[PDB]
Write an enzyme that holds these catalytic residues in place. Structure first.
Site, short mmCIF file in Angstrom:
data_model
loop_
_atom_site.label_atom_id
_atom_site.label_comp_id
_atom_site.label_asym_id
_atom_site.label_seq_id
_atom_site.Cartn_x
_atom_site.Cartn_y
_atom_site.Cartn_z
N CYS A 4 31.85 34.11 55.47
CA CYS A 4 30.83 34.44 54.44
C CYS A 4 29.69 35.14 55.20
CB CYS A 4 30.48 33.22 53.58
SG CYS A 4 30.12 31.68 54.54
N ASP A 11 24.80 35.09 43.38
CA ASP A 11 23.77 35.21 44.45
C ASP A 11 23.08 33.85 44.67
OD1 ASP A 11 24.15 38.00 44.96
OD2 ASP A 11 22.09 38.56 44.32
N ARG A 37 30.08 28.72 51.87
CA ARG A 37 31.28 29.09 51.08
C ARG A 37 32.54 28.92 51.93
NH1 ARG A 37 28.61 34.69 48.65
NH2 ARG A 37 26.63 33.67 48.04
N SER A 38 32.49 29.33 53.21
CA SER A 38 33.65 29.26 54.15
C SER A 38 34.11 27.80 54.25
CB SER A 38 33.32 29.82 55.51
OG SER A 38 33.17 31.25 55.48
N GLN A 88 26.68 23.63 52.86
CA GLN A 88 25.23 23.89 53.17
C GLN A 88 24.28 23.21 52.19
OE1 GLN A 88 25.61 28.35 53.64
NE2 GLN A 88 23.93 27.97 55.05
#
Ligand SMILES: CS(=O)(=O)N1CCCc2ccccc21
EC number: 3.1.3.48
Length: 284
Positions: free
Chosen positions: A215, A181, A221-222, A262
């Site tokens: 994602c 998370d 993450r992508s 990110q």
């Protein structure tokens, strides 16, 4: 410069935030006017994450062709990817219309439906074989065929039917279920194993339309998934693997979708994954 030495030098110098801001400053800025039209407000999960006009995927319909999705076309590597947000309650029919129209063989999901106690994407595929889903707005039927649950990922076989023509296709759903998370994985070993299972399936190959990768926002993450895959393919294709520059590949991919990677911790993780994946393929 060999990226493993660049890596140790950034670690020793603690300069991951500075390197990451330099990428942010140099990144492309292209218009996203279609994303910002008032009629498209409930088609966007995040006000600050939009596809560029020049690279956006168009739905094949005259009413409203908009979806939050981008075509990332990597010319030297000869790989294409569609990067998209997690589907919203009102865009699950659009999502599967896009998979159908683009002739995709695979969907790669890098989030859980619930993370941090909040919904990160719609439950957009069926959980039981005998309870199929019908998308009345796009005229599609989706059936769960089989599910294989592993410690770090789940693979599903799905059947998508165009109810207009009664044509059917097999879609493979690759669900990475263990991204924490908060932050990034301590080791890239399970993420690389997952990338290699998607490759093994044919989902990334040129006989199919582009893989669909998501994602929650479809950038963090992508971005890590496509960046690692493209860098490893270039290291295989070139005479000098040490010439592959991860920062230059990331800026090329940012020509096609804003905000890929990110955080500085995602940047460091992408370097770790490429360095460890290079060794394993080298018969080493
Ligand atoms: C202090 S840092 O700027 O170097 N930094 C930025 C965030 C990501 C990261 C991960 C491992 C070690 C250092 C870092």
């Amino acid at each position: 410069m060999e990226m493993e030495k660049e890596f140790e030098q950034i670690d020793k110098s603690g300069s991951w935030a500075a390197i990451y801001q330099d990428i942010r400053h140099e990144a492309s800025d292209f218009p996203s006017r279609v994303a910002k039209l008032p009629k498209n407000k409930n088609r966007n999960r995040y006000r600050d994450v939009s596809p560029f006009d020049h690279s956006r995927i168009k739905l094949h319909q005259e009413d409203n062709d908009y979806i939050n999705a981008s075509l990332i076309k990597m010319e030297e590597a000869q790989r294409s990817y569609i990067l998209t947000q997690g589907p919203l309650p009102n865009t699950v029919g659009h999502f599967w219309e896009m998979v159908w129209e683009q002739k995709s063989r695979g969907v790669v999901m890098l989030n859980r439906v619930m993370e941090k106690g909040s919904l990160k994407c719609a439950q957009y595929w069926p959980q039981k074989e005998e309870k199929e889903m019908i998308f009345e707005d796009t005229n599609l039927k989706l059936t769960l065929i089989s599910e294989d649950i592993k410690s770090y990922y789940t693979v599903r076989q799905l059947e998508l039917e165009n109810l207009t023509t009664q044509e059917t296709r097999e879609i493979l759903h690759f669900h990475y279920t263990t991204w924490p998370d908060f932050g990034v994985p301590e080791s890239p070993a399970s993420f690389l194993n997952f990338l290699f299972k998607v490759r093994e399936s044919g989902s990334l190959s040129p006989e199919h339309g582009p893989v669909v990768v998501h994602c929650s926002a479809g950038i963090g993450r992508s971005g890590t998934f496509c960046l690692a895959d493209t860098c490893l393919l270039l290291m295989d294709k070139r005479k000098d693997p040490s010439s592959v520059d991860i920062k230059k590949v990331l800026l090329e991919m940012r020509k096609f979708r804003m905000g890929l990677i990110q955080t500085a911790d995602q940047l460091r993780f992408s370097y770790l994954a490429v360095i460890e994946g290079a060794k394993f393929i080298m018969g080493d």
